[PDB]
Amino acid sequence: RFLKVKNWETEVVLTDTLHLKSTLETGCTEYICMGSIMHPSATKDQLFPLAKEFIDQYYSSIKRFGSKAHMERLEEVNKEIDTTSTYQLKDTELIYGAKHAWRNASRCVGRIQWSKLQVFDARDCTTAHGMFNYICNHVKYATNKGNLRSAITIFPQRTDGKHDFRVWNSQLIRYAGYKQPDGSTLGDPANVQFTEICIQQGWKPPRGRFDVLPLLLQANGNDPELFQIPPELVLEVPIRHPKFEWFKDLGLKWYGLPAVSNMLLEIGGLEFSACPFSGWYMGTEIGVRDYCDNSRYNILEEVAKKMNLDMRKTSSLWKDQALVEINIAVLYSFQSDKVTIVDHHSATESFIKHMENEYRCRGGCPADWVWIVPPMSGSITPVFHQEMLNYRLTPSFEYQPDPWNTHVWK
Amino acid sequence: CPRFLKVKNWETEVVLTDTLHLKSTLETGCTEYICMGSIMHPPEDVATKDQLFPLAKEFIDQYYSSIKRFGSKAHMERLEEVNKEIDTTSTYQLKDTELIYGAKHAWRNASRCVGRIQWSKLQVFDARDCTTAHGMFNYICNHVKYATNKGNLRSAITIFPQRTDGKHDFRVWNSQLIRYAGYKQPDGSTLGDPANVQFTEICIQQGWKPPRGRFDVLPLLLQANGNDPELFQIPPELVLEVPIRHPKFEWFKDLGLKWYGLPAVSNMLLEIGGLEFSACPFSGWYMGTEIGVRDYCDNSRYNILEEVAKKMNLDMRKTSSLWKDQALVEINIAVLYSFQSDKVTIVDHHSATESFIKHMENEYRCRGGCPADWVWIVPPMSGSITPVFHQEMLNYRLTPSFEYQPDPWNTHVWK
Ligand code: HEM
Ligand code: HEM
Ligand SMILES: CN[C@H](C)Cc1cc(C#N)cc(OCc2ccc3c(C)cc(N)nc3c2)c1
Ligand SMILES: CN[C@H](C)Cc1cc(C#N)cc(OCc2ccc3c(C)cc(N)nc3c2)c1
Ligand SMILES: C[C@H](O)[C@H](O)[C@H]1CNc2nc(N)[nH]c(=O)c2N1
Ligand SMILES: C[C@H](O)[C@H](O)[C@H]1CNc2nc(N)[nH]c(=O)c2N1
Ligand SMILES: [Zn+2]
Secondary structure, X not given: OOEEEEEOOOOOXXXXXXXXXXXOOOOOOOOOEOOOOOOOOOOHHHHHHHHHHHHHXXXXXXXOOOOHHHHHHHHHHHHHHHHHOOOOOOHHHHHHHHHHHHHOOOOOOOHHHOOOOEXXXXXXXXXXXXXXXXXXXXXXXXXXXXXXXXXXXXXXXXXXXXXXXXXXXXXXXXXXXXXXXXXXXXEOHHHXXXXXXXXXXXXXXXXXXXXXXXXXXXXXXXXXXXXXXXXXXXXXXEOOOOOOOOHHHHOOEEEOOOXXXXXXXXXXXXXXXXXXEEOOEEHHHHHHHHHHOOOOOOOHHHHHHXXXXXXXXXXXXXXXXXXXXXXXXXXXXXXXXXXXXXXXXXXXXXHXXXXXXXXXXXXXXXXXXXXXXXXXXXXXXXXXXXXXXXXXXXXXXXXXXXXXXXXXXX | OOOOEEEEEOOOOOEEEEOHHHHOOEOOOOOOOOEOOOOOOOOOOOOOHHHHXXXXXXXXXXXXXXXXXXOOHHHHHHHXXXXXXXXXXXXXXXXXXXXXXXXXXXXXXXXXXXXXXHOOOOEEEEOOOOOOHHHHHHHHHHHHHHHHHHHOOOOEEEEOOOOOOOOOOOEEOOOEOOOEOEEEOOOOOEEEOHHHHHHHXXXXXXXXXXXXOOOOEOOEEEEOOOOOXXXXXXXXXXXXXXXXXXOXXXXXHHHOOEEEOOOEEOOOEEEEXXXXXXXXXXXXXEEHHHHHHHXXXXXXXXXXXXXHHHHOOOOOOOHHHOHHHHHHHHHHXXXXXXXXXXXXXXXXXXXXXXXXXXXHHHHHHHHOOOOOOHHHHOOOOOHHHOOOOOEOOOEOEOOOEEEOOOOHHHOOOOO
């Protein structure tokens, strides 16, 4: 069936046909919706239909479906699976695949940018040192002195599962977190465990509030190895406020480059367990979640104090006031330093225009309202009033288990 | 379907186990391949005899199970009597105890409601003896006066006769018992509340003389026993209102805003044991953001963000200054302050969401689950700094339930 989605602000109605193409499951059933669950629950014979599906849509995309090149590619891929239990993507295919995993990422509000993705092919990498070099080149290219550029670096595909490439970091650039004797936490609490693993593996921690973590890199299933990203490659922004001169005294800072490194990229049945991808920040990622989550830096108290707000009763909305001032500061700081950042109004507005684009040229756009709507000021952004259909298309980015739960060492 | 489903809270690491989803009765709209969780809503005939039997049994079973009399003589006798009623009259009547139980549970089962910790405290008014629109007016006035209670609001529901053949429906045409009029102008602008322009137009056609102001309380438009609906003015002394002012900003009162104290939704259908109560106005008290974010700051509503921001002398040239967010907070501060000052019950979104988490935990423990719609439960501002943002939720449909129904002017056969 054709499915309609309505914007209750603009009364615009879109018709979704694209969902008919999806084959992966969402987790919901006719009787139970699991839309707010974070993660709802190969062989030769499995592999070829997935390969064929992907090759077909690639040649469909370049308007050469059923061509000589198409026919021959199908042939080629089948001999390669038969004789080696897997196959290799052409470079064009790799690029097509990576862009479309981004395009299909229902939880990403930044997808208007999807076809502007710099794809670095690192499938010839064999060691952790090689991984480090590739990652440094990625970071340097994507940072571009503040004029951030979207990029993905793709390491060799999974083979037998015992020879995985993995970036153990969840992002290429993150701050360490230290569990105090106090019982409290210095730095970023989200990373306390990873930090402990780095220390255990020989990393000498500065024990500051914003210590950049080392890279911890696993090549071909071997034990991971530690590397320091050269400091000059790590662009950082000191957070100050355009009116509160005391804000700089808080000593806050953050890094310019968000580069997620712990997801899995799947294309045509092949699995890329190491594929760090990066873009630029939406301000709330830092200002709302990274700084104000109770389980994160948790600075609301300190700010509201410096703002001399009455914090006895919750109905004074002192938290809400402090939250807005923090996000103002973050946006102002990045902008003053000419580091690319987008506010949640501009981003969601861009996403609405993107949905309209996709419905017109593609027959729909999979989108996850729970993640698309920003973590503050929800209903005064246009996505709040936008009905969305969430479904799973491939190529995709998938979650995978943390390496320290699978890997067995020396 | 799996017997045990787990939900996690990503802030506290607490994991809860849901078994209640097994009692799910209706569909959600979702499938294995698509999720419709952000769709707002995923013939004039009635339940046949054969349709009605198992629906009634299911409900009667559940009622006798709740009073710890399952399998009792009284339980079996009640089943027999209901069955005979359905067989001889193709419908049946609920006992007062059952009616009260059913209403309370429709609320308990309402996945989109953040206020459900209060579900067992609901004054139920039985109006199944009502025959006319004047009588409906009488019941509604008594409902309003009771629930308002001079600002100390008390949750209540008034239940009018159930549907029979569908040509004798009782309906409140209003969407809430108390709402302000909206007037479209010839120049295309709107006076009052833009959400209510269509209903306002219907009232004016029905004979209502409109004051044409910014905050004109609408008349009740009341349909009894399938007859043409009739207009009634709610006695102004029964309509509690709060003028909105701000603790710091003296100029805020000059904006001339006010709102009414009693939120009383009147266009939903109450479904119990297969019976349909098409007129069942229910009321509680407000969460601040219902007024301060949606009513006032929605673009298609009163839309005051600009005027507030201008009086705050905010830089409104670039969105990245977050002038909208700044203004939104002050407005919501004003709403909570004005209600508290006038001693009219209201709850802020931090307190409400914290109570909902405690409520949800309790329901998982005592009931085996709590259906919840994250998309509606999370408040329209400051989402992630409330504890429901990080709380995984399962959504499913239990009966008794509150349901959407078509607007009555779309289906009514005018006499
Ligand atoms: C270019 C600017 C971009 C912006 C502003 C942006 C914005 C966002 C935001 C705000 C989120 C939610 C993050 C969270 O709350 O944890 C997100 C999720 C996501 N983004 Fe984007 N993004 C951008 C680029 C990209 C790129 C280049 C990729 C991949 C090639 C990508 C893939 C994803 C994926 C896969 C998710 C969801 C991951 C999950 O399911 O947990 N994004 N994005
Ligand atoms: C006692 C204080 C109450 C509070 C603070 C409260 C709060 C809320 C809020 C904020 C919403 C979302 C409304 C929206 O955004 O449109 C809601 C929805 C809802 N409430 Fe409650 N409520 C209360 C009482 C009640 C009562 C007494 C009932 C019925 C007996 C009820 C039944 C419902 C239903 C069915 C919805 C969903 C309506 C829909 O699906 O459109 N609530 N509530
Ligand atoms: C506490 N929040 C947790 C870490 C949720 C999360 C998990 C994973 C994984 N695996 C990956 C995640 O990535 C979100 C994401 C991914 C890519 C992004 C890019 C490329 C840019 C950007 N501005 N934000 C992103 C945000 C998030
Ligand atoms: C413009 N948005 C529309 C009006 C959404 C909506 C539709 C319907 C219906 N039918 C019913 C709705 O009810 C929400 C509701 C219901 C009862 C409430 C009670 C009893 C108290 C309270 N504070 N809010 C409520 C909020 C909402
Ligand atoms: C499109 C979206 O489903 C729609 O705007 C919903 C979102 N969440 C909501 N949540 C509440 N509480 N009230 C609403 O009216 C809505 N609207
Ligand atoms: C339980 C809930 O699904 C979880 O907190 C989600 C909600 N929405 C989110 N939305 C975004 N953008 N990022 C998140 O991490 C989350 N967390
Ligand atoms: Zn769903």
